[PDB]
Design a binder for this molecule. Structure first.
Ligand SMILES: CC(=O)N[C@H]1[C@H]([C@H](O)[C@H](O)CO)OC(C(=O)O)=C[C@@H]1O
Length: 489
């Protein structure tokens, strides 16, 4: 590493998370000027769920120069957290953990009006990922009210005759009566006040066979575990916790996806950051991007009451479930521009003028090359004029073959003198090269730091490639002043 690369790891193999791998960066400068970050702690190599993944978290007091020890605010204990070197061979490289619960794909958001920070992540029951989730919400309605549904072990497959109700009281819905079972605030199970338990799994390889085997370590039976007496419906959930103390402590787990459409296979987070509206009618609205295999592809969830309640909105009617990972910026009036990945070989743009309730048709973004499968991007507002215009920054790879050639772009915003969603034009005038064209570059998250420097946490390899799986120390942190970035190639 060069002098300039010292301090370019936040999460790394050997830190406190006990993970050898990390993916999916999230980076956010708070209003106070503290800076926080989050990423997947991918234990079982860099595979997506299904796997064993927890959400990692760290922060910087010194404006993002330096980072504290990492924490695990969203974590499951059904399989142990350990440092294991995943095989990289033609056969083994493909092997993933079949039986663990996971948190995956974080989003960080701050309510600046209340100084509350929210952490969201997809919540996967045991052995589930987006690809093998079932169709359904995971909740039932009982006398008009939504309750998380549960399968008792000795009931017929696909039979969910129970529900978590007030106080975590588990009810039998056939007779509508409380049982002796309940869940606590962690969704761990109890029988007549007594903690239920089960044996934690280990995983070790013998050659290219992955051996997932019980140990003699008791952990709390959780409804998200493979070996629980009561089990949630095996679809994708959204989880959130909040902190008022900049991530020093976290609130209780919230399964917020009560709005998951019954017709959807998965509904998951567009990783990166969310947005608080600063200007206009809907100023103060909190909004978080989502995408799904459902009635719609792109969606959002928003709160007009500082995080207590969340409303789901569909931005299109595509049923094909392409990976429409999005990030959102604000126009100076306060309308929203969203930039998103697609599976159609380009990055797309959409506008909303009603605070994200409705959205315009997708518009391709010509200026940036990408692959057919696409990659996640990061877009943000910059607080300062740039050549005397309001500006945004976008980070994304810039190649048609592979995830590589990452750029940071500066877009300059103009009024076109037209009306509505067309009020504004973005001029992508600057294009900064992060490394070289053949260097790998995948997911990324920008933030503007306190001093007005631009921070970047990114995947410095190609995370799609089947030949770059299970690499360590690929998650890189760099800082730039705004003049560095003003390049015109
Ligand atoms: C929830 C989940 O799996 N998210 C993953 C997403 C997904 O795998 C798929 O592309 C669409 O269903 O893709 C990628 C990726 O590197 O492309 C990373 C995410 O971690």
């Amino acid at each position: 590493g060069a002098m300039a690369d010292i301090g370019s790891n936040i999460f790394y193999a050997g830190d406190a998370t006990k993970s050898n791998y990390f993916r999916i960066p999230s980076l956010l400068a708070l209003d106070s000027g503290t800076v926080i970050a989050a990423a997947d702690a991918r234990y079982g190599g860099t595979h997506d769920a299904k796997s064993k993944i927890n959400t990692a978290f760290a922060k910087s007091t010194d404006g993002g120069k330096t980072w504290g020890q990492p924490t695990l605010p969203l974590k499951f204990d059904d399989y142990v957290a350990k440092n294991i070197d995943w095989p990289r061979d033609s056969v083994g490289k493909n092997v993933q953990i079949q039986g663990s619960a996971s948190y995956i794909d974080p989003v960080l958001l701050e309510d600046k009006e209340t100084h509350r920070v929210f952490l969201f992540a997809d919540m996967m029951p045991a052995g589930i990922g987006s690809s093998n989730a079932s169709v359904g919400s995971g909740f039932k309605e009982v006398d008009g009210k939504k309750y998380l549904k549960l399968h008792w072990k000795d009931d017929a497959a696909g039979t969910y005759d129970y529900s978590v109700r007030e106080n975590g009281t588990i009810y039998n819905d056939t007779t509508n009566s409380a049982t002796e079972y309940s869940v606590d605030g962690e969704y761990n199970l109890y029988k007549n006040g007594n903690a239920m338990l089960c044996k934690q799994y280990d995983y070790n390889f013998e050659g290219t066979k992955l051996l997932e085997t019980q140990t003699d370590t008791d952990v709390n039976m959780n409804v998200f575990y493979k070996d629980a007496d009561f089990k949630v419906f095996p679809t994708t959930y959204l989880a959130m916790k909040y902190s008022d103390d900049e991530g020093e402590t976290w609130s209780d787990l919230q399964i917020v996806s009560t709005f998951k459409p019954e017709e959807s296979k998965f509904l998951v987070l567009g990783p990166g950051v969310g947005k608080q509206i600063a200007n206009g009618e809907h100023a103060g609205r909190l909004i978080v991007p989502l995408y799904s295999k459902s009635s719609a592809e792109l969606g959002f969830m928003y709160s007009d009451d500082h995080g207590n309640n969340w409303t789901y909105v569909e931005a299109d009617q595509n049923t094909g479930g392409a990976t429409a990972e999005a990030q959102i910026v604000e126009m100076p009036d306060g309308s929203l521009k969203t930039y998103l990945r697609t599976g159609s070989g380009y990055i797309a743009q959409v506008m909303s003028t009603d605070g994200g309730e409705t959205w315009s048709e997708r518009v391709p973004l010509t200026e940036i090359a990408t692959t057919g499968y696409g990659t996640q991007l990061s877009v943000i507002n910059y607080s300062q004029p740039v050549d005397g215009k309001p500006a945004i920054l976008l980070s994304a790879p810039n190649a048609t073959n592979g995830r590589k050639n990452g750029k940071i772009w500066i877009g300059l915003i103009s009024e076109t003198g037209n009306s509505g969603k067309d009020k504004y034009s973005v001029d992508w005038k600057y294009c900064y090269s992060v490394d070289t064209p053949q260097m790998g570059y995948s997911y990324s998250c920008l933030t503007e730091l306190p001093d007005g420097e631009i921070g970047l946490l990114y995947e410095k390899y190609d995370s799609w490639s089947r030949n770059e799986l299970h690499l360590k120390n690929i998650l890189k942190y760099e800082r730039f002043n705004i003049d560095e970035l003003k390049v015109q190639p």
